[PDB]
């Protein structure tokens, strides 16, 4: 509900930056990766991951919130049967914060009635803003990790390592986190000259065994306008201060 141009202004101002690479994983902006398991709650893991990231960046605090509470209590979404990121944030505002996952443990598909007064203090957001599909790098650099949607395919669920560029999904279907962008020099075996390969760094919610310890790299250009699998057609980021 806010305006990107006005927000980015106060967080960026002048401070020019390098489009080649920046990784919040090396700047206290990414909390540990979790696992949704058997239950379609990526939309929640994505959201909550974004807010934990905001606390580590702005409050210097390291907390892990409860996506269970969000799954049980977000009447805008459909718990383990899907949801939207912006609905997630929406309800966080109404609920008035979410409890630490230490008091409200995750149990995925297991039957579970919602209960808000289940922790001493809750953590919430002031509001959230949407990021233009041509500002992800800028956004990431001065605002922080972004909760995004992306179209996933089998070639994706089978990713192991490196900067992926396999086949995409049919339509947007999975929710993830954008925690940065990198760049690797790779000598073309035919011209024998090293070429620059840019990419985005994504945090998934399928555990640490998947991909590179839970993360995956996606091919992109220096400006980051190339959004493979439409990654980012849905891009939101919570504000807590």
């Amino acid at each position: 509900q806010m305006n990107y141009e006005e927000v980015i202004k106060k967080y960026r101002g002048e401070e020019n930056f390098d489009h080649a690479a920046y990784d919040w994983r090396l700047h206290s902006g990414v909390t540990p990766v979790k696992d949704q398991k058997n239950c379609g709650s990526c939309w929640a893991f994505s959201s909550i991951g974004s807010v934990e990231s905001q606390y580590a960046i702005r409050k210097n605090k390291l907390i892990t919130l409860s996506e269970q509470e969000l799954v049980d209590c977000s009447f805008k979404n459909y718990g383990c049967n899907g949801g939207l990121i912006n609905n997630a944030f929406e309800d966080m505002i109404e609920l008035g914060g979410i409890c630490p996952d230490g008091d409200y443990p995750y149990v995925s598909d297991a039957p579970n009635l919602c209960n808000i007064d289940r922790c001493t203090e809750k953590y919430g957001i002031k509001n959230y803003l949407s990021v233009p599909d041509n500002k992800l790098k800028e956004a990431l650099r001065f605002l922080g990790p972004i909760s995004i949607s992306v179209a996933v395919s089998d070639d994706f669920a089978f990713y192991k390592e490196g900067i992926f560029d396999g086949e995409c999904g049919d339509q947007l279907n999975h929710a993830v986190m954008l925690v940065g962008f990198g760049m690797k020099e790779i000598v073309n075996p035919l011209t024998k000259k090293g070429e620059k390969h840019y990419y985005y760094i994504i945090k998934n919610s399928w555990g640490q065994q998947w991909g590179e310890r839970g993360f995956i790299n996606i091919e992109t250009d220096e400006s980051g306008l190339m959004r493979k699998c439409g990654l980012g057609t849905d891009a939101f980021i919570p504000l807590i201060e």
């Binding site: 058997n38 990526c42 949801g83």
Partner: protein, 111 residues
């Protein structure tokens, strides 16, 4: 509209076949009947993306005039009299986690 909700997925979806195949094979094995069953048709299948892949099958099963694969598997034929063929409908819920080369049968309740 939603991320992470169960989607349709076509009948010839190779990933599904494998999913069904597993389900059925698992069944005949769990069944105590000396005759192996097998699917008449796939009514309504849906695939949900999660920490792995989840399938939801609605199929009509039937009893065939065959042994428990000790054969092939492989297509016999269904029993000629509908009472030995004991046709019915089942709902399978398979859960595959490929990057862990594992697969399960979460739910298999028949009518």
């Amino acid at each position: 509209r939603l991320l992470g909700a169960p989607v349709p997925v076509d009948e010839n979806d190779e990933g599904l076949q494998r999913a069904l195949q597993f389900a059925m094979a698992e069944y005949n094995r769990a069944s105590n009947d000396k005759y192996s069953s097998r699917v008449v048709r796939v009514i309504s299948a849906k695939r949900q993306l999660v920490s792995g892949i989840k399938y939801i099958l609605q199929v009509e099963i039937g009893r065939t005039t065959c042994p428990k694969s000790s054969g092939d598997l492989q297509s016999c034929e269904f029993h000629d009299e509908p009472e030995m063929a004991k046709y019915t409908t089942c709902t399978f819920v398979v859960y595959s986690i490929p990057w862990l080369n594992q697969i399960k049968l979460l739910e298999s309740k028949c009518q």
